[PDB]
Each structure stands twice: as C-alpha cells, then as structure tokens.
Design a protein around this ligand. Sequence first.
Ligand SMILES: NC(=O)C1=CN([C@@H]2O[C@H](COP(=O)(O)OP(=O)(O)OC[C@H]3O[C@@H](n4cnc5c(N)ncnc54)[C@H](O)[C@@H]3O)[C@@H](O)[C@H]2O)C=CC1
Ligand SMILES: Cc1cc2nc3c(=O)[nH]c(=O)nc-3n(C[C@H](O)[C@H](O)[C@H](O)COP(=O)(O)O)c2cc1C
Ligand code: SF4
Ligand code: SF4
Ligand code: SF4
Ligand code: SF4
Ligand code: SF4
Ligand code: FES
Ligand code: FES
Lengths: 226, 120, 156, 439, 225
Amino acid sequence: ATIHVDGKEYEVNGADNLLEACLSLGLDIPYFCWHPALGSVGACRQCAVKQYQNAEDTRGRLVMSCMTPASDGTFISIDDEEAKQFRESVVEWLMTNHPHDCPVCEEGGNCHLQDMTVMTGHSFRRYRFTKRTHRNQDLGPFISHEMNRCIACYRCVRYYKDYADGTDLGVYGAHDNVYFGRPEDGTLESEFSGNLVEICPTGVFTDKTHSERYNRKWDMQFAPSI
Amino acid sequence: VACNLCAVACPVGCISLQKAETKDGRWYPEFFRINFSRCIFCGLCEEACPTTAIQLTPDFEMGEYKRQDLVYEKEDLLISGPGKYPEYNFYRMAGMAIDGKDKGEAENEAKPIDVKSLLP
Amino acid sequence: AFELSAAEREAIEHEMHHYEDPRAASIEALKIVQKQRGWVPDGAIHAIADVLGIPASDVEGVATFYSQIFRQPVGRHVIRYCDSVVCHINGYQGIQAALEKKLNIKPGQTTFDGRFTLLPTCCLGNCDKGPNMMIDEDTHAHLTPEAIPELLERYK
Amino acid sequence: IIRTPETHPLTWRLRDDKQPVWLDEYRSKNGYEGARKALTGLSPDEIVNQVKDAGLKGRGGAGFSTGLKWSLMPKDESMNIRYLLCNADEMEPGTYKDRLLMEQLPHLLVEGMLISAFALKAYRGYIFLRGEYIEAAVNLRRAIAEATEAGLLGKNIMGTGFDFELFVHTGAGRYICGEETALINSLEGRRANPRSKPPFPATSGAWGKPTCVNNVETLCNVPAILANGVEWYQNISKSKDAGTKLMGFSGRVKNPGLWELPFGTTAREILEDYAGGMRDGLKFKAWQPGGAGTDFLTEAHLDLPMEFESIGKAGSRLGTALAMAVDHEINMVSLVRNLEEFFARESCGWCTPCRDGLPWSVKILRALERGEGQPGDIETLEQLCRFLGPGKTFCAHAPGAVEPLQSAIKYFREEFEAGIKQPFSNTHLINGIQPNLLK
Amino acid sequence: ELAGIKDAAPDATFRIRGQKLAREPHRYSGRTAMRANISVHEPRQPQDIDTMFTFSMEGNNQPTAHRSQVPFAWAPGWNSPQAWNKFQDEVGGKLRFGDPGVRLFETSENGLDYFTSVPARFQPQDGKWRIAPYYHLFGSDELSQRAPVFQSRMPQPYIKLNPADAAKLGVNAGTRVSFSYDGNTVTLPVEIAEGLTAGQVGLPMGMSGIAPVLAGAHLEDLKEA
Ligand SMILES: NC(=O)C1=CN([C@@H]2O[C@H](COP(=O)(O)OP(=O)(O)OC[C@H]3O[C@@H](n4cnc5c(N)ncnc54)[C@H](O)[C@@H]3O)[C@@H](O)[C@H]2O)C=CC1
Ligand SMILES: Cc1cc2nc3c(=O)[nH]c(=O)nc-3n(C[C@H](O)[C@H](O)[C@H](O)COP(=O)(O)O)c2cc1C
Ligand code: SF4
Ligand code: SF4
Ligand code: SF4
Ligand code: SF4
Ligand code: SF4
Ligand code: FES
Ligand code: FES
C-alpha cells in the first residue's frame, strides 16, 4: 500500500491501521487506548490525524489513525495545525482531573501519560475548577491501586478480560466517574495480572514489590536476562 | 518525598537517596547523603525540587579536615524549619492520601463520588 | 449473606428464555431484585452473576452504569423530578424547592424515617405537560408547588 | 383539526378520551390490512423495495432512508437469524411522540414490526422501551398478547409459515441507550457503550447477527404505506421528505402538544395555528427545532419549512421535529447550563472529548451563571464546540451536546459575556517564588 | 548437541561501532555519592570481560543499533514500555534485527514409532493412596517460594480428599490428618475436592515438605490425627 504522510511517500501494509503503520515508520503519533497486543477501539481519541480525499485536497477531516486502515493511496497529515491542537486538547482534557502526584507516583519517569503530555506540547493549565477523586482498593500483595491517576483509556479491562480471560476486574460507573478495578477489595485472581503495571499508561496499577524499595527507571541497572 | 529528581538533575551526581514509606502512606527518604567534596553549589537540585525540600542556604563556612566527613547524611542536612520557602506543602497539592489528609481533602479536589451513588 | 428467593430466580430464568445469550437478562435480573427488595445489595451482584453465568464484575458494571438500578439503600418511595430543559422552562425549580421544604432533604438522600428518597432525573417524556415528577410507578404532571404536600401525603 | 386516514395515517384512530385502541377497535378501523397484504401477496424484497421508493426516512432524528437501511442486510442464506429492534427509548428532552404512539396505539407498532420483520426476514423482534414508560409497556404487552391470541404473532402467522416473536425489553434509564449500537449493547445485557461503524448493525448487529434498529414512528408509518400504496404516500406532500411527521411545539406556549403534519409545514404554522402562540406576558426569544441536541434558532427562522434540508442549511437540524420555545423571561446561560448538565451526566464515559470536556463546559456555564466567569471562558466554550463536532468523538452524543452551546454563543453572546466578572486566576501565590508575569 | 549455544548471543568482543552495550541509562544518577557512605573515594568501575555489556552508561542503547540483546527500552520522548515500539521493525512484531536466541534442534526428517505400552486403568486399592499432583504458580517453584512476597500469596498447605474417601476416613473439611512418607509423619488439613477421583489424595507439589518427586507415588496409614 502507498500512503503520503505530510508530503512524504511511504510503503506500508494495507492490512494494518494508520497508527501502527506510522509507528512502524518511526513517525510519532500520540496514543493511549491502542495496544499492539490488544487492537484498536478508538477510546482515548488521541491518535487524530488529518485525512485528505486526494493529493489536491486542502480541507480534510480529523480521523483516528488507529481506526483508519492504511490502504493504498492514503493521504494523511500528522503535523497539521488542527490535528496538533486537537491532540493537545485531548491531553488537556486528561489533565483536568489528574492529581498533582508525579513525585509520589511510582510511574514517574516511566509514564506513558507524561510522555504524551510532553509530546503534545501541553504545559499550560487554564482549568481552574476541581478535580475528581476516587478511593483506592486493595488488589493483593503484587498490584497497588491508585484510581485518581486513571485517564479512562480502557486498556486494563481490555487486556484483563478480552486478552487474559480474567473475571475479577471491570469498569463501573458512567460519565467522568468511571472506575476501574475489582467489585470489592481482594487479590487479583488472574495469573497474568502483573502485566497491568505496563498495560496501564498511568500510575494506577503499579508494582507493589517494586514500590517497597522504589527507585526510578533512570536509576536502574538493567540486564537482558531469562 | 524521596522523588529522586534532585539526584538526577545533579550534573556531578553527588546526591544519593532511597525512598521509604510510613504506614499511613507518606513517602520520605530512608537516607539522604550528599558528597560535599563533589558538589559545585550550582543549585540545580533546588531548582528541580517539586516540594522545595532541598535548599541552598547563605552559608559558606564548610571547611573540613578529612574528606570522609564531607559526605553529609540526613542527620546533618535536615533542619528544624521551612527555610527560604515558609508555606509550601507538597502533600496539600498531591492527590495521594497520607495521615491527616484523606481523598478529596487536597486543594482543588472534589470529594470522591462512589459509583454506587443514587445520583445520575 | 444474600440468598435469591424462588420467585426472583424463576423470573430470572424466564427472562433468560427470551434471549439467545443469558447475559442479556442481567439488567432485568437487577430490576427483579430491586423490585423485590427496594435496591440491589452487594450479595445480590454475586447471586445474579452465579445464576446468569457471567462474572460479577460485569454485573456490577451494569448495575453501576444505569442510574435506575440502585446500589445504595433507598426509601420506600422514590421521587424522581425531571430537571431537563423543557421542565426548566416550565419551572421545575419551584417544585424541587417545595420537595426540599417538605422532605427536609437534599437530592440524592433519604428522609429520617426511610419514607422518601428524592432524586433528580432525566426527561420523563412528558414535556408538553410539564413540569413532571415520577413517584415509584406513577407519573404526575402539571406540577405546582402548592400541590406537592397534597401529592406526598398519599404515599405512605 | 379533522383527522382522515388519507391525511393523518398515524393519529386518525386516536380516541377522544385518550384511551388505548385495542385489537377489536383497531381491526374495525382498517387494522392489519397492510400486514395481510404484505404477508400474503408480497415478497420480502418487494416490501423492502416498496418502502425504499416510498421515501420513508427514519423518524428517529437522523433522516436516513429506511428502505436503504433495510436493503443493506446481507443476502447470504447461512444468516437465517435476524433481529428487528424498535428504539422506544425516547430519552431526548423535548421528545414525547413515541409515548403518544405506544400509549394509545400499540397495535400500530405491533403491525409495523410484523411487516418490517417479514420484509427483513427477521425471526425475532425486541421493543427496547425505556423504564419510565410504564403505561406504554403495559399497553404494548397487552397488544402483543392480543395479537398472539388472534394469530398475528408467534408461529405460522396468517398461514404463511412466517414465525415472528416480539418481546418488550424495558430499559434501566440511560440516554445513551437510544443510540442504536449502544441499544444493541444494552439489549445484549452490557454497559451501553456505542460501537464504531463500519461494521453497521445491518451486517453484524445484535449478537453478531444482522439487526435493523428503527424508531417507533418509522415502524408506525410502515403499515400505512403497505395498506394505502406507494402512490398515496408520495403525494401526501409536494416536498423532498415524504409522508407525515409528528411535529409538536412545547414550552410556555398556549397549547403545547403534538400534531401529525405533512413535511414542509412551516414552524410558524405549528407555533401559532396549532400551539396558539406564546402565553400572555411572554415574548418569543428562541426555539429549538428537534429536541435538546439541535441548535437554537431565532424568530427570523420561524418562517422555515420543517424539512431536513431547510433546517440543515439554516444552521440546525430537523431532528425529531418537536420544537421547544424559549421566551425572554428564561436566561439563555441558565438554559445552556441545564442542557450541558444533562448532556454531561448522560455521557457513557467511553471517549475522552465528551466525557472530559462536557463537565468543563458545565463548570464554565455554572461560573457564568453566578457571574464568576473569567476571560477566556467563552473562547474555551467555542474551542469545545469546535473540537466536539462530528468525527471528533466516538458517537454523536457530544455534537448534539455542543450544538446548543455554539448556537447560543452565536445568537446570544451578550448573555454569556455578562457572566464574566473577575480576572483570570488559576494559581495562588507561593511565598519565596516570583511568578512568571506572562504577557 | 549444545553447539547452537554459541549463537545464542554474540561474544564479549561484540561492539556497536566500537563501543559496548550500556547496562544502565545515560541519566544514571548518584555516581559520586551512592557509595560515599563506605569510602569517599569513588571505586573503580566494574569490568565485564564475560559479556559485551558494560557496568556503566558508557555504551550504546540505540533502537537502530544492530543487535538482538536489548537491556531496556528507552527512546527520546518515549520513557514508557512503549519504547519497544521504537525497538521493533514493526510494532507488535519482532525485533529490528531479529529476536535473540536460537533453536538447538530442527524438525527431524523421520518420526518415532507408536508407543504400544498402553497403561491399564487406575484401580483404587484399599489402604494405599495415590498422590495426585497439584501445582501452584505461587509455591511450587523453589526459588519463587523462597520469596517473602509470595508467602502471603502462597496457599496454606493442604491435602485434597474425595468426598467418598473423606466419608470413608470420617473427616470433614478443615480437620487435620496425618500421613507417613519415608518415615516422616506429616499432618495437613483436609480440603474436599469433588473433581478428584476416588482412591487419590491431592498434594501441593514443590511446597515445603512436599517434594515434586511425590507425584504419582503412594501413601500409607492416612488417618485423622
Ligand atoms: N430520542 C431521540 O429521538 C433522539 C434522537 N437523536 C438524533 O439521532 C441522530 C444521531 O444518531 P446517529 O445514529 O448518530 O445517526 P446516523 O446518521 O449516524 O445513523 C442513523 C441511522 O442511519 C443508518 N446509517 C447511517 N449511515 C449509514 C451508512 N453509511 N450505512 C448504513 N447505515 C447507515 C444507521 O445504521 C442508523 O440506523 C441525530 O439526528 C439526533 O437528532 C439524538 C438523541 C435522541
Ligand atoms: C446519543 C444518541 C441518542 C439517540 N437516542 C435515540 C432514541 O432514544 N430513540 C431513537 O429512535 N433514536 C435515537 N438515536 C438515533 C439512532 O442512532 C438511530 O437513528 C435510530 O435508533 C434509528 O434510526 P431511524 O430514524 O432511521 O429509524 C440516538 C442517537 C444518538 C447519537
Ligand atoms: S500516572 Fe503519570 S502523570 Fe499521573 S501522577 Fe503518575 S507519573 Fe504523573
Ligand atoms: S486504570 Fe490505567 S489502563 Fe485502566 S483505563 Fe485507567 S489509565 Fe487505562
Ligand atoms: S548544587 Fe551541588 S548537589 Fe545541587 S545539583 Fe548542583 S552540584 Fe549537585
Ligand atoms: S529533595 Fe526534593 S527533588 Fe530531591 S528527592 Fe526530595 S522531594 Fe525530590
Ligand atoms: S461521545 Fe463518547 S463518551 Fe460521550 S456518549 Fe458518545 S461514546 Fe460515550
Ligand atoms: S489510540 Fe486511537 S483513539 Fe486511542
Ligand atoms: S423535559 Fe421534563 S418531561 Fe421532558
């Protein structure tokens, strides 16, 4: 397939969507709800790019790159001004309820939400009202729960239920009061519940064993082991 | 709150700390040590503190006989008052619950609404 | 704990006969339990989940998504006053103020005797006869603040 | 108003005492004759094509061609399981047409679902009805029992070998459940989050099977087409939209109600000749043509025919064609605050712009209500209007949420600017730190 | 037969444009103070003669570097686990220059013969109890069950009994029964297992006191303590 991103021609796979095709080419599009192992559901509305009907088109429309296929002869723009403003607006809406928690959060320096906040160029807050609060649950000795940091990207429920076939983690409530977790306090019953600490782009589900003796990612000595 | 921003913002790398936690959930440094034989007194650590805990004070008289005694620990750094910033409290800003401050008690924070609430 | 009665379980199974997936009867199962017991207690979620064959997280998410399935204890009579735009034009606010004055409660809570629970609600579909109120199964239209204590005394 | 079968195909059977019309009275007044014609003398594809060239558009508020939506069901013969769903939700503020249709004429809806299920080869049908229409639910269940007793429902209807089972699914009170994909999800017993299209419900809808979702009024319009013929339906009015629409006018008018009118009837004809004008002491200020989700229009737009195209080019939508009148005594900012409060609390929480930006608009309008507005608030509201438009959110809840906000800013900006009093302040002073006085 | 382990990873002389592979990130902190409690003189950097990696940041961790062993994923602007997107040839696929590790053996050209040794059916003999293995993700592995965070997650030690076998032994759920294996009478509480077949007791393999060598073995004098 042939796509044109910002006037540059690329050869992609027509069976992929535009987000995974453009991320495979090294282009940077912010995203939250899409995962390579989970698929595209179009929740966070963050991966917006401007699609044009043909080469001689100037108007276009904002579409989700994760929901739009990477078909042949597809003209899109990532660095368009309207798309950039919309992505910064999505980060701004996610920043309205987010707690002032980065120093005391175990995802600091390892946070996908921090990365996409910086990448969108959003560093000014014109929101002056209150932020919603949630009480935490006890998820057992491995996963620490902090629901204030959630951005409702639905990755945890999608992985835990649709991928890992777990039953004890879900989504409750409606509007901006959506809550993610167990119906009551107790240990997460899945054998693959620890992948939530990397599935969650925020610091909601965190490693409690690492949180006991915590240090940031830049302070680690890593090795490739088995 | 042992957030390790000052240690990584240091261009010399003369700040070492480890995060401990109280039973009520408050982060603090288990130890905090600064190699003052290495420190260039540039103030990037004070610039990087989001709680204004680390502070460079107007005092220069710091000569030492042995270089081992130029490694100041937490018992030699922690003072009895707020220093140059007399009112800032990070935990009032934060949404994490600690002792004496529950959910919704932070500034610009609403009270937590349960999903089981009868209101639409 | 919680135990599902025979009538509730029989009604739930009869509702499961109406669909090709038993999960489709979760909303009506919660409605059956709420009709019998006034609300849905915490053990009812697990009982309904065990009966239908779906996880309790799904049942709790359904019961918390919809506003008419109550996961907190309510009064004997649920007053639901419409606060939408047409009833805002026709003056629902005087009706709401009369309800506060008579019941001595805010919206979303219950009286001291457990008689009434006052709730704002969406558009009741009766906008040409507004303002509208809905006590448990009876809808009242053409509301005036002078008629609220006359309306509330007939619900024991 | 004189109601004839040729001019009022829907409401000419309505009783004077507002009582429901049961099976014997309905069949006396030419009931189930269209169902008899369709099920005995017509192929399902013939009925689909008949509805398609009748010009029957969807009365749910979008105006899509119902016959074209019927034709998009697959022709594959392995998919012999098909569903017809009646969107009896009606959760839009300002909409009360289906309550009148089902509370007094449930057999019209039963006959319409029977004809449409024969046309769509739909073996099962569900009336997704809201939980607050108790009388409509009772009357629909009684009409279904009466039709099942007389052989209009169940197995082997009219000796044609067509089996159709009709159920009534009573809802649990959410406005998002009226969205047809969220309607399918709530019919499946799940949280009523909508689904992305394509795939549309025709190819894969309820439980992955082919599924057609239609409003009460469309299925009520169907048997008149199947009984009186196509040519009667095309010559009801000389307009691009065929047939009669239930149009009403509500909100502090002399005669608030609902009347069956041909398409192309002007809104001033509804407001004055049918609603009797505004109440005494109240002057007309604005109106919404088709419910809470449509844009406000002024008194200059009252001389406009109520069609999809005419209200579309005027900066609004025809919608459900149940107009609402706002007088001068009602503040515009309070009305938009109420609308946005409803639209924000009825968000399903699936996607970021609606879920996290409608409460921001609610907070801004609350600040503008008590005069606590600050500079940049109306600019923020305009940015939310631009960024919550069609294609930017997952479903069409938020475009309908920001339509009244953008129209009220466009036409009544002097009321919104009157709420901005204090200067902008997001920070507090921290002792020992000099602020960055940006310019 | 282990000739393929040479190609599992490149040797200690492997370089990326002359430099080694960094173990720690470039922004590694506290170099002159993490060991200052012991000695203010900073120690020598540890030497890694075994591998191509180095015990410092003085190395390469570029996502476009021609290697298969990646110690951690970091790209500028991607500090999250989403830097693996930068480290892959396509997202969700393989690594850019191949995944590490090699297969020791290929598929053989010829198969095996049919195993004609069909076992007989399980006959539950009285007085002897066949041990059915129960494996736990938290407790069966030796090193993992030595971890203190597993101790709350480990199940309490048990013996599983069929309802018919428990009724024959006259024991309900929770009571403690003793059984002797190689002269070690160990006492465990009874849990009723409906799915377990009669004539069998279920034991948690890999636990403290219950070796995995006990699986498939028999038991004697099982009785209520
Ligand atoms: N209570 C009520 O009556 C309410 C009505 N509405 C109205 O609902 C409308 C928005 O609803 P939507 O579902 O978003 O409208 P839509 O235009 O996306 O679709 C409406 C119908 O057309 C069909 N359709 C549209 N494009 C199609 C295509 N390319 N292929 C196949 N089928 C297609 C859909 O399947 C559906 O049956 C607005 O006009 C609004 O006024 C909104 C809120 C409440
Ligand atoms: C947020 C939202 C709510 C809706 N609510 C209803 C509703 O309550 N009743 C209805 O008939 N259509 C509703 N619709 C329109 C449906 O998407 C769809 O048009 C309808 O179910 C059938 O279309 P039709 O008019 O062609 O029959 C809603 C749409 C949206 C976006
Ligand atoms: S989840 Fe991310 S943005 Fe939120 S407090 Fe933690 S590090 Fe900061
Ligand atoms: S808890 Fe984490 S993974 Fe789940 S929706 Fe919230 S941000 Fe996404
Ligand atoms: S003032 Fe000293 S300790 Fe602080 S960043 Fe500079 S060199 Fe490091
Ligand atoms: S002194 Fe400040 S910057 Fe350093 S770890 Fe403590 S809170 Fe963080
Ligand atoms: S716009 Fe988004 S969050 Fe709002 S109701 Fe639709 S899908 Fe749900
Ligand atoms: S990544 Fe596309 S909307 Fe979330
Ligand atoms: S606006 Fe209140 S009944 Fe519709």
